[PDB]
Amino acid sequence: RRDPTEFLRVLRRMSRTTSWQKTMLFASKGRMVGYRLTREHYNTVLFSQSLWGRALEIVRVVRAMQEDKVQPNGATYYYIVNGMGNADHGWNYDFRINRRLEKIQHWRVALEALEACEANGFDSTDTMHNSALITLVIPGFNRWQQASLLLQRMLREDRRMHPTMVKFYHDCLVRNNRPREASSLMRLAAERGVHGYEDKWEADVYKGRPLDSEVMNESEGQASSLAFASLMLRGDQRPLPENLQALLEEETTRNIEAERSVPVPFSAGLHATEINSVFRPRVYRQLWYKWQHIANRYRPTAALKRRQLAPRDSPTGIPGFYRI
Amino acid sequence: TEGTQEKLAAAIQEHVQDAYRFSGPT
Amino acid sequence: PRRIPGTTKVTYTNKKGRTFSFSVPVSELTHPQVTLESAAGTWREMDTSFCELGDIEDDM
RNA sequence: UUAGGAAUAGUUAAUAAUAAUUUAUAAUUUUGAUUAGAUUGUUUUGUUAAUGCUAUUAGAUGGGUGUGGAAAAAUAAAAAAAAUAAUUAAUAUAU
Ligand SMILES: [Mg+2]
């Protein structure tokens, strides 16, 4: 055992310069020879796993941090929630990228760190709540009910919406067949001044219609209008008699499921949101940590062309750029 | 069977020195 | 939100024996004292038992 | 093919198995693999006494549309494209 200040000094350099496997090797083998890892040691490991988006590794660090009885601070929860948003997901051609992310409940660890942040007394940031909503919403996951309740209390705390969160949450509500929640998201992002959405503003075609949960509550318990409260009319339309309209509602019920049961022959069982949606964080393409990029998609290969950075038969310093 | 923990400690210490080789000088 | 009262009364006795109230301007804390290296043991921990990892000694 | 040479994997074979819930002592690699770098190849080039050294510009392109025999399809001075349009010649293009 050398100097523990020297042990922390190499841990500072590897989180700052090299990849995520170096801090996981150094802190684990250093804990086994007897280096007492403090909160300063775990925040440097959790900085490197949050940058590369290693969702399985953040769970293993927080299991060792709770075993060593070292209390996390507000900077520690800043890396747990922002690190779950940077996890790899998406679909190559018929190949699921990071399929073991689904069995881990990494959206729930990002939610559990939010509950432990306010219970221990720390102040959560605006990028924690935008990164926690992303983990419920990303194309391997379909959780828009919990992401709606998270966004509802995000406005009550006067948080501002991140433009990456609006891009993911709009595609999740479109995929899960919710146009009222998607039109209200575009209407909200245009009014709050979110960048990239000040031109997209949709009219509220559901202005007179009640909520979808209120109709199911009214249907369990005016009686002619109670059964047809869910039916949407143009104003120049009238309902049928109650025996004739109820036979017509079962016609549309069996016709909608008949169309949705037919597979599209060249989709590999995927929605159009899932097609060509491979995600790695911004570290994979010649970039490093920035705070405003929560879940930043890696830049395309047309940003850096070869033979404009170095001439022919000469090496370029981009080893893993064009590899997706 | 009893002297495997100290051998494990020596092996993990050797791995820690191999990781210390990343630091370079001093 | 609960507002801090600001003033507090403490009892002081003179040399003769007369007791009265010193009014002290006192505010409360807002942030936890987490910068100390000592751990009290009373903080809300994060549950990680639902996560699936490569631990072959545990169950899925 | 790499001045400072080590591990690799949607993995190998069998199969009453299209569309693999099984079996196996599986497969690649120090006779140099995978990855990273450079990278169309090619007795067509140049030189020399030289079986040496040194160069290259035919090409292809698993999510744009299951159409079509074949995706090679978002742009090419001809490859004249279903009535002899014109077929003497040269510019054949600027115009
Ligand atoms: Mg068999």
Measured torsion, CA atoms of residues A168, A174, A176, A179, in degrees rounded to the nearest 10: 130
Distances (CA, A) of A213 to A144, A209, A210: 15, 12, 9
A323 touches strand D (CB under 7 A): yes
Q: What is the CA radius of gyration of chain C?
A: 25
Burial bucket for residue C57 (CB in 10 Å: 0-12, 13-18, 19+) = exposed
Question: Is A307's CB less than 7 Å from nucleic acid strand D?
Answer: yes
> From CA A240, how far away is CA A23, in angstroms rounded?
69
Three-class SS of A252-284:
HHHHHHHHHCCCCCCCCCCCCCCCCCCECCHHH
Q: Which contiguous run of DSSP H or E holds residue A213?
A: helix A212-220
Show Cβ contacts of residue A183 under 8 Å, excluding neighbours closer than 6 positions.
A202, A203, A204, A205, A206
Does residue A70 contact residue A39 with C-beta atoms inside 8 Å? yes
- The Cβ of residue A294 has, within 10 Å, a number of other Cβ atoms equal to 23
Burial C39-52 (b: 16+ CB within 10 A, else e): eeeebeebebeebe
| Cβ neighbourhood burial of C24 (10 Å; 0-12, 13-18, 19+) | exposed
Q: Residue for token digits 């404009």? A: A308
Look at residues A315, A262, A281, A314 and name the one whose alpha carbon lies nearest to residue A49: A281
Chain C residues whose CB is inside 8 A of the A74 CB are 34
Q: What is the CA angle A18-A20-A22, rounded to 5?
A: 70
Q: What's this structure's resolution in Å?
A: 3.1
For residue A321, give the nucleotide whose C1' atom is nearest its CA: D36
Touching chains, C (3+ CB pairs < 8 A): A
For helices A74-85 and A106-119, give the axis angle rounded to 10 degrees: 160
DSSP labels for A114-174? HHHHHHTTPPPPHHHHHHHHHHTTSTT----HHHHHHHHHHHHTTPPPPHHHHHHHHHHHH
Residues A119, A277: Cα–Cα separation, whole Å: 36
Q: Counting Cβ atoms within 10 Å, is residue A113 exposed (0-12), middle (13-18) or buried (19+)?
A: buried
The sign of the torsion formed by the CA atoms of A40, A42, A43, A48 equals positive
Q: Are A34 and A1 in contact (CB under 8 A)?
A: yes
Give the torsion through C-alpha atoms of A231, A235, A236, A238, to 10 deg: 40
Cα gap A69→A45, rounded to integer Å: 17
With the C-alpha atoms ordered A219, A222, A227, A229, is the resulting torsion angle positive or negative?
A: negative
A98 is in an annotated binding site: yes
Contact A116, C45 (CB under 8 A): yes
Of B11, A77, A36, whose CA–CA distance to A27 is shortest?
A36
Here the tokens at position C27 are 């505010």
Provide the angle, in degrees to the nearest 10, between the axes of the packed helices A55-67 and A20-33.
20
| CB environment A204-240: b (16+ within 10 A), e (fewer) | eeeeebeeeeeeeeeeeeeeeeeeeeeeeeeeeeeee
The tokens for A22 are 């170096």
The set of chains that have 3 or more CB pairs under 8 A with B is A
Q: What is the dihedral of CA A72, A109, A11, A321, to 10 degrees?
A: -150
Mutate: best of A11, A12, A29, A45, partner B, most B CBs <10 A:
A29
Distance CA A52, CA C6 (A): 47
DSSP H/E element including A15 = helix A4-16
CA–CA separation, A306 vs A323, rounded Å?
13
Chain C residues close to A70, C-beta within 8 Å: 39
- What interhelical angle do A20-33 and A39-52 show, nearest 10? 150
Under a CB-based contact definition with an 8 Å cutoff, are residues A164 and A138 in contact? no
Experimentally, how was this structure solved?
cryo-EM
Q: Which of A25, A82, A97, A94 is nearest to A280 (CA)?
A: A97
> Rounded to an integer, what is the distance from CA A47 to the centroid of its chain?
19
Longest dimension (CA), chain B: 39
Other beta carbons less than 10 A from residue A298's beta carbon: 18
CB A292 within 8 A of CB A130: no
Q: Is A92 annotated as a binding residue?
A: no
